[PDB]
Structures are given as C-alpha cells and as structure tokens.
Fold this protein.
Amino acid sequence: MRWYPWLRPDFEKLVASYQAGRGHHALLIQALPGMGDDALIYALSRYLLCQQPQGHKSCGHCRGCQLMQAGTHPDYYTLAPEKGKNTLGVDAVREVTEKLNEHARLGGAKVVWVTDAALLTDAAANALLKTLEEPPAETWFFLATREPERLLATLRSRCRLHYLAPPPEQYAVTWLSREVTMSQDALLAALRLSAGSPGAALALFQGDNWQARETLCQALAYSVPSGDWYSLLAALNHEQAPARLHWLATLLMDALKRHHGAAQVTNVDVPGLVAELANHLSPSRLQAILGDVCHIREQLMSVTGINRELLITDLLLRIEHYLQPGVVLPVPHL
Amino acid sequence: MIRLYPEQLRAQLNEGLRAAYLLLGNDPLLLQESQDAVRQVAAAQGFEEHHTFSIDPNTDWNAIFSLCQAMSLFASRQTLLLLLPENGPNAAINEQLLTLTGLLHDDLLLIVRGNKLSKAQENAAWFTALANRSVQVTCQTPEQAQLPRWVAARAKQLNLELDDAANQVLCYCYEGNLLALAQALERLSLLWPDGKLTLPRVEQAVNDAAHFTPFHWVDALLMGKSKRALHILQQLRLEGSEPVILLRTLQRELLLLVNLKRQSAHTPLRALFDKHRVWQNRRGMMGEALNRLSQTQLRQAVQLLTRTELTLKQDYGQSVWAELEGLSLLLCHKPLAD
Amino acid sequence: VLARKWRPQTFADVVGQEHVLTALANGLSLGRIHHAYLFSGTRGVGKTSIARLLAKGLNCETGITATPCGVCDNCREIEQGRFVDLIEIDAASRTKVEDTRDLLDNVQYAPARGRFKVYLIDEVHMLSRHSFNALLKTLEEPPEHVKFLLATTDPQKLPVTILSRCLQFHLKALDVEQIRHQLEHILNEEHIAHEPRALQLLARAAEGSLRDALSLTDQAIASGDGQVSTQAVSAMLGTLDDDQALSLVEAMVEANGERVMALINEAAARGIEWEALLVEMLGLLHRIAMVQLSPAALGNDMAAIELRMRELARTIPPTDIQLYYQTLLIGRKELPYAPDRRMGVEMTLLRALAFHPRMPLPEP
Amino acid sequence: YQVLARKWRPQTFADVVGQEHVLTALANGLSLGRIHHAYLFSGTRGVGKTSIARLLAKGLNCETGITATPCGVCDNCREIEQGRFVDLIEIDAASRTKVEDTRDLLDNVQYAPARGRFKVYLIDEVHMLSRHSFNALLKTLEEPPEHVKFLLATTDPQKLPVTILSRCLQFHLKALDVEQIRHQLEHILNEEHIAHEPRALQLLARAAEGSLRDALSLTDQAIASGDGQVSTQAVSAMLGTLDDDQALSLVEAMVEANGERVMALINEAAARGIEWEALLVEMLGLLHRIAMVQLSPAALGNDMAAIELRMRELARTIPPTDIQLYYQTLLIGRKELPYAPDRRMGVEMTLLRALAFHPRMPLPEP
Amino acid sequence: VLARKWRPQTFADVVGQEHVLTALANGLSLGRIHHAYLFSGTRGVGKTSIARLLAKGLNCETGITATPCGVCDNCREIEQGRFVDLIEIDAASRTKVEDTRDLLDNVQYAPARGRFKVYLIDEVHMLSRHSFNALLKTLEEPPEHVKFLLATTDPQKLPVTILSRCLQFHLKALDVEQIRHQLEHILNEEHIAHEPRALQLLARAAEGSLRDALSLTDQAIASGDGQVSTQAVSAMLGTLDDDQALSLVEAMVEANGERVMALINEAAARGIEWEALLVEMLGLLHRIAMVQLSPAALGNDMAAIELRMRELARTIPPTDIQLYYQTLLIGRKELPYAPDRRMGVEMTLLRALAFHPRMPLPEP
Ligand SMILES: Nc1ncnc2c1ncn2[C@@H]1O[C@H](COP(=O)(O)OP(=O)(O)O)[C@@H](O)[C@H]1O
Ligand SMILES: Nc1ncnc2c1ncn2[C@@H]1O[C@H](COP(=O)(O)OP(=O)(O)O)[C@@H](O)[C@H]1O
Ligand SMILES: [Zn+2]
Ligand SMILES: [Zn+2]
Ligand SMILES: [Zn+2]
Ligand SMILES: [Zn+2]
C-alpha cells in the first residue's frame, strides 16, 4: 500500500475516462506481485468517492475524503476472502450485491474491490455476474488478478481488462538502486526473479533474503563441480524451503536455456554458475532435476506437514543418482 | 551453592533448609526423591501452601511474575516449584526467572527443577543470584559401571536378593531408564514374594513381559537379521505404537548412516562418532551397519521412507505398516533398480 | 439479444439433445403422457427450452403433438410467457419465495384454457422442505389435467421420493463445433458480419452452453463494431490474436531454442495466459496431423496459415507430431505443479526440443 | 403412469437386492427387539442406504408391532413409503437450503413420538453436518431417550470422528456387481412383459454404477425413447455409446490402417451425438474381448453373436502383441482426454496415433 | 452379547496376561497392597477386566483375596457396576466431564460399605490438567482406605509424576493362536457350530483383542444364522484362501491362460478389490526378487508359502522376474482408466501372457 511512480501513466487514463463518462463499471487489473496493484485500485476509488474533487485528485476535507482517510465509508466495499480459508464465498457476494441495490448513503458513486478474483468459488463467480448485467446506476467495480485466464470466460468478458505493465527494466533498476544499495547486477537479478515487479524485487532484499540467497549459490558452486549435492541440505532445509527451491530452479532453467543458446538469463547475478552447471550437466540431466525440484517444492507447500528434512534429503541423494552414468531419468505423467 | 549428589541431600537438609533448591537433571526417580526430601522437611516446618509454575514460551507469563510479586500477609508460606522447559531456559526466560528470584525470603522456599543447565545457562543473572543462598542437587542417570551398582543398591533397600547375572539382565534391558528398573524391581517383588531374584527367575519374567522400544526395531534393523525386526515390528503394533512415531525413529538413525557412510576418507570412523554424539555403545553396531550397506542401498532406503512419509500424509490412512515391513527388508538384502 | 431471439420454437430447432427429443416425441405422438418430467443438466444446454416446447406440444389447440403448430393462441401465449395454464415457478428466486410456496400449496386442478394445467419449476432442488413435501404429495396423488415439468442442474440435491416420480432426462453439454455451427446459422440468417476464427473462439469460450454462447456473441456485437470479428472476440476473451502459437511450433520443431525461449519472453511481456498458449499449440499440432491424413482438414479462418500449416504437414514425421502433442499435453497437466506458470511452459517446450530427433545433445 | 424406479421401490426386506447380511442383521434385531439407539449405514451413493433405512423405520413404527415383515397397508407403512411421516424426520445435512432446519431439529429432539412408537431420525451424510449441530448429535447420542433412535448415512465413514463411529452399530452396504444389476433388470423386464436385447441391458447395467435406483430410472428413459422396447438402438443412443457394430468397425478401421474410414466413422458418429469418452471405452473393451478369445475361443459373450464372426476374425488374424498396443494407445488416450484441447479432438488424436504407430503399416514420410 | 456375557469373573478366566496376573495374585495373597495400579496396553486386551477383578479381590467380604468368592454382595454389586465403593470414572467421555472433574476434586476418604474406597479411571491420560494435579496430589498424600486403579492405552501421554506413583502393568495384545483357542472354547460351551478355518478368519480379524473377537463372532452368528461357517465369516471378513495372488503369478509364469482366467473368474465371484490383488502380486514378485540375492528373505508367515516361493526364486530368471514386475506395475497404473476394473486385470495378465519369455502366443 505505497504509491509507486509507474502507477501514474495508467492512473491518468483511468480517471480520464471517469471524468469524460467513458468509465467502465467493471475493471479487471492484471499485474505481477508487488507491481503496485494494491495502490492503483485504492488511488482510483479516492477520486470517485470525493464530494468536492480538485481536478485530478481529492480535497481532503469533504465527507468522502474524511470518512475515506478514516477508512470506514458507506460506499467503499472491500471484498476480502473469508478470514481463514483460501477462497471467497457465494455469501459475501450476495450481501454486497443487495447492499448496492439501495441508494448511496452519501449521494454519489458506490465502489467495490476484489483482492483476487481467481480465488473465488465457482458458484461465487456466477453469483457476481447477474449484477454486472443489471448495473445499479453510477456504481463502480474493481476486480484484480495475477492470472486472468484462470477466470471464467463469461466473467472476464463483462469487465475491461487493463494490463499493469512492469516498468521498463532500466527504470526499475534505477528506482531500486535508491531503495537499497547493491550491485546493479544483483538488482537486475531480483527484478527478473519477480517477473519485473519492482515491489517484489525490493522485498527480495529486505529480509536478509538476499543474503540467504547468496548462501545458496555458494553451496551450489561447491556441489556442481564436486558432485556432492547433498551439501545443499543445510542451504535448503529451512522453513523458507519453497522459496529456496524455486531459486534453485531458476538456476536450473538458465543452464537448460544456455544449451539451446538462449540469450536471456534470469540469474545474471552469477553467470559463472549457470555456465559450469550447463557444462557438467547434459540438457537431459538438467530436465530431470528441474522437475524433481519442482514437484518436491510443491509437496512442501501443499501437503500439511511432511518431513522437510527427509523429503529434501531424498531429493538431494536422488539428484546424484541421475548424475551417474547409465541411469534412466524420469518422464512426466498422465 | 553447595553442589551435591542425591545421596548427600538428607544429611545437608539436617543442618538447615536453604533458600532455594535447584534439581537439575534427567532422572525421573532422582528428581522426585530429592523433591520429596525437600518438601518432607519443609511441611515439617510450617510450609502449608505448595505451588508449581511451569516456564516455556507461551504458558502464562504475567501470572508467574505477579503470583510471587505478592508477599505473604498472615504468613502462610507456600512452596514454589518452578518447572524449567524441556530444552532449558532461553534468553527471555533468564529474565522472568530473575524477576522471580527477587521474590524470595525466608518464608518462601523456591525449588526449581529441570535437566542439567549448560555452562552458559549457568552464568545467567537468575542462577548467579541464588549462588550463595541455594543448594544444587545433580539428578542425572548412572554410568555403565555403576548402573548395575545402582540397581543393586536400590534392590537391596527393597529387601531383594538380586543376583549379579540377573542384575545384568535387568540392566541390558531398560538400559538407562531408571524409572523402569525401579518398577521392574517392584513388579519382580510381587512375582517372587520369596525375595530370591535368581537369574533363571528374573530371566523368565523379563523375557515373558515382552516389552520392546521403537529403537529395538532399528537396533535390529541395522543389518541385523530381518526375522527379529519383522517380529519386533509386528510386536510393536501390540504395544499401541503409532506408525508416524516409528518413521521418525528410523529417519533419524537412517539419515545418520547416510552422513557417516559419506564420510569414509573424510575422517576415520572413530572421531566421527564422537562428533555426532550418539555413539554410546551403538558403536560397533553402527559401524557393522556401515560396513555392509552400500552407498546406494542407503539411498534406496531413503526413497522408500519418503514415499511412506507421503503415503502416510497424502491419503492419511493407506496402511503404512505394509511399507514399514517392506522397508525393514531393504536394510538387510541387496536391492535392484526396479 | 440473440439468445431470446433464437430460443427453440420447435423440437427441430433444438440442437443436439437427440436422445431426449426422440423420447419426448415418441411419447407425445403416441399419446403416452406421464404426470411429471424432469430435465437435468448443466447451464444453457436447453432444459427450459425443451420443457417449454413440451408444454407447448401438450396444449396446442391442434392437438397433443410433438410438433406444436406455433400459430394458435395457446402456442403464441406460451411463447410470450403469458399463458394462463403454464405456471412458471422459479425456486432459485430470492424474491418469489412466497409465490413459490403458495402456488405449490394451491395447485389448480382444472385448466382454465388449455387441456392441461402445466407447472414448470426452474432449479427445483432449491425448493424449501415444506414445498418438496407439497410437491411430493401432488406427485403421489397425480391430479389429472395437471403436469409437472421440473428442471435442475443438480438432480441429486433432490429428495429421491420425488426424483423417482418423474421421467428423467439428462441433457448434455454440447461439442464445440456443435455450438460453432449454431452461432453461424444465427449470424447468417441475421445478416451480421462474421469471421471463422471468431465463431471458434466464441464457441470454445462458452463451455458447452448455447445460452452463454449467445450472451458472449452479444457482447462482441456491443464491444466491437456491429461485427462479430476476431478482433472483437479475442478482445473480450484474451486471446493473443497473434500468430505466436504457430511460430512457437515452427521454432520448436526446427530445434531453435534461442527463438523458442525468445518467443516465450516476448509472449510473457504481453501478459499471455500460459495455459491458453499451450492449448493453441495442441490444437495446431492436431489439425496438422489431420492434414497429414486427409489434406482437406485445414479449415475456415485457418486459411491464413494454410501454407505454413501444410509445410509442417509435409515436412515433420507424424510419428513425431504425436510426440510433440503428447509432450505438451503432459505439460498442461504439470503446469500448475510448476513454481511459476511460465517456467512451466519453458520446462515443456525445452523438453520437446531435447526429445527431438536430431536435436540438442550432451557434452563434458 | 409408472416408471419402474417407483413401481419397484422396495416395500419389503425381501424385495431388496443382494445385501443379504445387512438385511439378516436387521431381521434378527427387529424380531428379538435388539434395537440400538444409533444405526450407521455407509457406502457409495446409489446403494440403498436411505432405502434400507426406511424399511427399518417401516418395521419400527408399524402398527402390526415391531416387525421384520411390515404390512404394506397400515397407515404407518404407507406414510413411510411416501417420505411423509410425523416422526420420521429426514434431514439432509448435505442441503444448502435446510441449514437452519437441520440445526434446529437437532437442537430440539422430540423425546415422545406423537403417533409411531419411535421418533426416527434419517440423516443422509452426517459427516457434512455443521460443527454446531454436530455437537448436538453427540450430546444426544451419549444419553438418548428410549423413544428416539437414529439412522445415520454416509458416503465417507472416515470423515466421521471415532467419537461417533463407536456409538453406532455400523453397516457397510456394498455396491452392486454389473451382472447382478443386469440379471435384475432382465428379471424385472421379463416380469413386465417388455421386450429387450441382452447387450442393451449390459449397457444399462454399466450405465448406472452399482445404483439400482438409477438402473431403473435409466431403464424408464430407455422405454420411453425406444417406444415400448429396451433395444440397443434406443439405449446406446441415450448414453451416446456406440452400437457394437459402430464400435466394432472403428476397431477394424484402425487395424486395417485406413485413415479416411476412421475419421469418417468418427464424423458420422459425432452426428448422432456421442459421449467421446464412451467411444474410447467401448473400443477398449472390444479390444479386451478379442485378446481373451485368442486365449480361449470360448470367451465371447452371448449377445456378441451379431458381431461374433467379425470379433472372431480379428482374433485369429491380428497378433496379440499388436492388440496390446492398440489397447494401450487407446487407454493412454483416455488418460489424456481431459487435457486435450477438445474432447472430440482428444479422441481423434488418440486414433491418429494408433494410425501413425500402426505395426503392420503406418503413416509414411520423405 | 458374548463380550459382556464372558467378561472375566476370576483371574483364572483371564486370557494370557500371566505376568500381570501372577504379580497381582502374589501381592493380594500376601496382603501387600499398593495405593495405585496402572494398567496399560492396546484395545480389548483385558485392562478393565483385570482392574475390575482387582477391585473385586480387594473388597470381597471373604477377605482380601486373589480369588474373590463371586457370590457375596460386594462381589455381585461390583459385577453389576452398582457397588457404592467402586467409583468408575471415564476420562474419555465428552458427557461426564463435570462428574469426572468433581469426583476427583472430592475424594471420599472413608468407604461406605467395603474395606476400601476404589476409584477406577478409564483412559486416565485424557484427564484435564486440572484433574491430573488433583490426582497427583492424592497420590502424593495416599489416603488410606482409598485405592486408584488406572487404565490407559497411552501411558506416555501421562505426567511422569503420576506414572511414577503407580504399580505399572503392561498388558500384551493377544497371540492369534491364543484368541483362536479361546473362541473354540466359548462356542463349545455354547453348543454353537463352527469350522476351524472360521475361527482363524476371526482371530486374525480382531487385532489382538478378545473383546473384539467376541463382537465379530456375534455378528458372524447373526449373519450365518446360528452357525459360524467360513462362508458367513468370509462374508465380512475380506478373505485370503480364495486369493490366487501367488497361484495367479505361478499360473502367469507357467503360461496356461486357461488357468489364469479361471482363477480371475473365481476371484471375481468372491468380490475382490482388483487393485489390492495387483498389489499382492507386485509385493510378491518384489520379494521373490529378493530371495535371489539373499536366502534370508523368508518372513514371519512366509511358512505355508515357503516352498512355492522358493521354487520360483530358483526356476525363474531375474530378468524375467523384472519383466513381470514391470508388466503388473504398468497394469496397476492403467487400472482406474480401463473400461472396467476387472477388465484391466484380465488384460494386464493377457499382456504378461503376450509378452512372455517362454511360450508366447502363436500366429498364422
Ligand atoms: N439445445 C439447444 N438448442 C438450441 N438453442 C439452445 C439450446 N440450449 C440453449 N439454447 C439457447 O440458450 C438460451 C437459454 O437456454 P435454456 O433453454 O434456458 O437452458 P437451460 O434451461 O439449460 O439453462 C435459449 O433461449 C437458446 O437461444
Ligand atoms: N485378557 C482377557 N481375558 C479374557 N477376556 C478378555 C480379555 N481382554 C478382553 N476380554 C473381553 O473383552 C471385553 C472388553 O475388554 P476390557 O476388559 O474392557 O479391556 P480393555 O479395557 O483393555 O479394552 C471383556 O468384557 C471380555 O469379554
Ligand atoms: Zn473530497
Ligand atoms: Zn398450436
Ligand atoms: Zn404396517
Ligand atoms: Zn466375594
């Protein structure tokens, strides 16, 4: 919830339509994590919930602006998923549908926002549609989702999809150099390891994450040439196992890409690594590992409580058997 | 802080009851007896109220601190027994204990009890505060040479003629669980009212009782013949042992073999065992295991354990026992690539 | 809109519910009428349409027929929804809860105009327990002159005592082409500009429901020009509308990697729905194999690719074409298994590149 | 005016099919008066869990006395078989609409029957009861009145806490076998004097999966659409599943390796609205029977006679090795089906593969 | 039912807990009574039975004895569970939570009728922390005239402060051949018909406990209507004799499809869980693979089989064993997708049969 600079060009045309009437009563914004998806929705609603707007932004005084700064307002409706569960309910929707079926308490526009539409119950989708078909005069909606395909075709048709494009890399890196002092080479790695999201990139550093990531590449650099992959156990076996396994995967991908002579590489941070890696590991061996790392990372995230230790030890030792001459590595199923 | 052994307590207690008694160790029996010895002497004084408060992250802090911040208005004295955490006092606890330590006086006897504190945990403000007023009783379980001696001593006071071979039998079974050796001696006394605990008698009753640790499965599973491990495994479902608790007993010893077999030419077997701190006779057995399990066998055994670990947590009821049988079979015979 | 304008007026106007239409027609034609009919199935597959035609066939002035004339007053009124002897009840409505309850507690045993008093109940499984029993009771002691036509997307949620008293008909979703073909027919007869790939994209988007198919077709007419154009259709749905899926296939099969990974990246920059991309590729890989079997398989808007598509057909081994398809399909299953949807797509295509006859090999 | 699903709705404990040992069990107790306060009936949906629960309450409250042989005429018996009885409270814990009534009725057990001897509580799938109304059942089970009795049903007995399982006399109702439903359907049709073809019944017997309710419901549709006859051509069509000749030619097309013919049969088939999954299934089984017949020439079933000459021909002319490949190709193709871009397409591709990988002749290239 | 009717009334009636019965008897006979007894062990092995007899031996009017007379009022009342000085507490009950808590907070130090006030606590480890301390406190300051008899399936879940104050007795599950001998006896005294195989199929079923064996046999009776026959017992108890699981593999590697199918139809008539059969086969072939590298691979109940397995282990090439292990492995995966589960198995074997090393199928 912090207004970033790249959110402007988009925010410009989005008000430019709410001022000239061209505004679409249902808006689906697609954007990578930490791209300021958060701040754009909120920033837009403050413009429509103003009693006495000053042109491009609000006044700060009016009932709207004040009850807005106070958060609590009779026209702003936050549709967060049911606290506890990872999905949303058919109930919440219906109760906000009929909530809008009655006159706006402050006499103006009414607005709705969704955390992530790709997380709702199938029934919750349909239950929402009928309202967009019968739009209560002068109301506004704001959908938001990282992945708009995993959304019902009949639903994503009613809204206007708007792509919140990660800013050009040169701009994102400069912005980043300010928030944290690190080699630009590192900075770019974080950016790329976030699909371009400068926000997530930034967060990659703020814990001690990056340092935790440096530990991983050092371990890997030892193992790659030595064969002792089981040495990674200390680097990976941790609650942050999944985030780490993913890291290990991006390095695997890269080595794979290099075998095909692919110009682009995510881990610019350590080209020497991806090189050696690709040198000692055939494109098949790499495929094999990439997967086990992949499926194993998932059982850690999904299954309630397996042994982080055993599973990984198994992943590790198993990786080493793929590396031995004569072994017939695995093939995907179904 | 008069540092002393469980035997030494009764004599000291006679001279004068001190401010605080810390009972630090792992022996259930030893801790209890010392605890009982203190209180028996206190209740003789006028110590009517008795209290116990357990310290660990999360179990009611503001209540502990305040419960002793209050004095004693008409001076009904109560025993306060602080139960230290299983791991030992952390950075934060050292303070909460310290706050409590300042709640003392002649009419408020403090008794703290837990296992042995580390030389570090012993510098801690709270500990050094009692270091002139209190007494420390080391309640810890007996070494290999005196375990038999302890059994003989404990048995003799139970008015028992415990033969030497028999004594050893009892020792080789329940090795180290003094609570068990004491119960066993007491049960053995009901069996033979006679008093005469000869080897034949004791041997019969010990083997007949048929009790087995999860460890005996593993101890057997260490390249020892499968027959007895399969026996113990199917005799471990008769003591009501959960599967999950078995898998994490096998895992711990299995991953340990993995690291050790991996360190041949890294360091001679000898020093490595010390390094891992589990080598406690298990050494010759652990190495016997290392010597006939191939780097690869050990691996396969890790996959199985993993499937099982998931099979048991994905369908959450897929009869893992079967796999445990299959697993115990891999640690004894050479496997294939199928 | 198209949906209301093209609502079936005769059983013949009905698309692919043959097994149901054949049984209803046989029964109607031979004067074999049961007291209650149950129509189940998903969304917009034709439950209400068929129930409505049945009511129409039952009350046609011309006589009980499987072919309502469509011009008599009973037929016209049923059509308008203003027929006194066709009582429509919506169990799913939050607003008509009392009317739903009352009408069912007060069945009108004697038709006022037609030969039968017909009750049509939508989403019958959403009825209160009170009404279920009211209905059961009536189905147990079958008023003559009164017929019950029930519809529901969830037969199982219904009390087995009631389900057991109905003639049950299970409607099926529809194949893509089946919807594609109907859309076309509507747009031709309606004189509205349309392209081939549009009708495909439109049909596939409506998952087996003609109901929605038309509602999407209507928003394509409003959003785009009053033209059902590829540009408009893939503007609502979110298709790339680009030759990307194809060129990716072309690269993949030459073992270009560099370009495959390149394309994946540019693709990523335009926010593609990674699963949608894989699906296009599979579809392409399929037509190709069809073209290799009977060279007339390249279809309608696929004329744009014709040359490229056929070039692959003649140059790549069918044995192989299957291999690529397979490898990608698999990819689609493991797609959400992947740490990131894109790396999932990269995992797959690099996979088809390696397990490439005459492709990437290993080294020291 | 009668659809078999209602005309044959079990009235007596004798009328129910095959679950002898659960009927016998209830017979004893209804005779000896050994009534447990809680009866748990588990098993898939479609098996007579609710159905058998009724015939229990039909002998519990019957005016003829607690009987294992209820009289179908007494006011209590008729009202029970019609879902409506004063004391027989039927709660579907699975209903989104009756959530309050479910909760209230369980919080307010009626300890004294108003008419019948017992106040029966038929509950379908209790493992889906709200955690709120679940405890109410617990509290009532630990100490239940003499007049109240429970009849619990479930699709998954494992989602029920051991605290409940231990309080009921559990009964597992197994599903029904194919030729146990087939044999039933033939009998019922034979007693109604309705014509039929045996390969039509097998399809209906498979159609419903171990669910005799559904088998009948399925048989009534078949009657209505085949105008008085349960014919393969009326049935095969409801399911959208191919006549063994339509399916048999596909198999032959594939083995002769002529592609046009295959796609033609698939197109011609699409016209009569198939269930693409089914077209794969029938072909697999057909391939399966040919494999058996190459082992024991006596393998073919009785109605197979129409296609017996063709089935037998392939059998001796096509190498079992090859037949194993076709079966594998088609199965694997079934695994794929939900991931294929389009169902009809998955099926075409699965076939074009069999063609491309054909053992005796395959698709060629330069 | 049998379980309640045959509850031990004397230590001599108790099945196999000798080490416990000998110690309790010695203590009782010599007037050596401890203040608290703990009985642990799994299900239906005799914990409550023995605790009850001890309470009986302690309060018998005849005197403190290891042989309660069984006819005095104290003995009869304890038996009925209506003895004022035997207070039964069930820590596992959700309904008696308050009574559990109250009774333990208010121990009655003076018996009203018998010489001792006895408390019997079932599943004592399920007590609240509050009650644990209440109990501890009482066990620390041992009221005379009051004895505590605790039972539990999980001693470890108990505070070591309490466990340490009890005389602990570990009951063992029972030996299968231990249960069978007892079933054989009960039926005989009951004049209830029975086949030797039948009692084994029950002894196996009840996992180590009589309580269960009895209820299983009670059910067996009701379903076999009077008799205890292998058929009625194999009606509920999933059976093993009908299982060609090893004779199917033999038949497989021997190549006589005739037999292989006959077995499968036979198996089918018994209602098998088709996938389990493929597990038994895959779990067998794996073990035969092991006897070829080390003869110490013969198990705790491999005995009947022994010769049959041992014959395969030497007369079948390891390559071929792998081949068959693979064929059944694959056939297991394909199973749920087959048109019919039986069909999968039938075809899976037909595959082993088609790709067999010796005597594979012929072709003209
Ligand atoms: N089988 C079908 N044949 C032709 N048009 C159909 C069919 N199913 C649906 N439609 C179209 O969809 C609209 C709504 O379908 P409807 O009959 O109400 O379906 P359902 O009751 O299953 O929701 C119709 O007015 C019609 O234009
Ligand atoms: N050791 C045993 N000897 C004889 N009968 C037994 C034994 N264990 C259990 N039973 C039978 O099982 C029933 C219940 O066992 P119970 O004594 O309550 O054991 P537990 O408390 O360990 O479950 C008894 O009433 C009895 O019929
Ligand atoms: Zn304002
Ligand atoms: Zn008309
Ligand atoms: Zn009656
Ligand atoms: Zn007596």
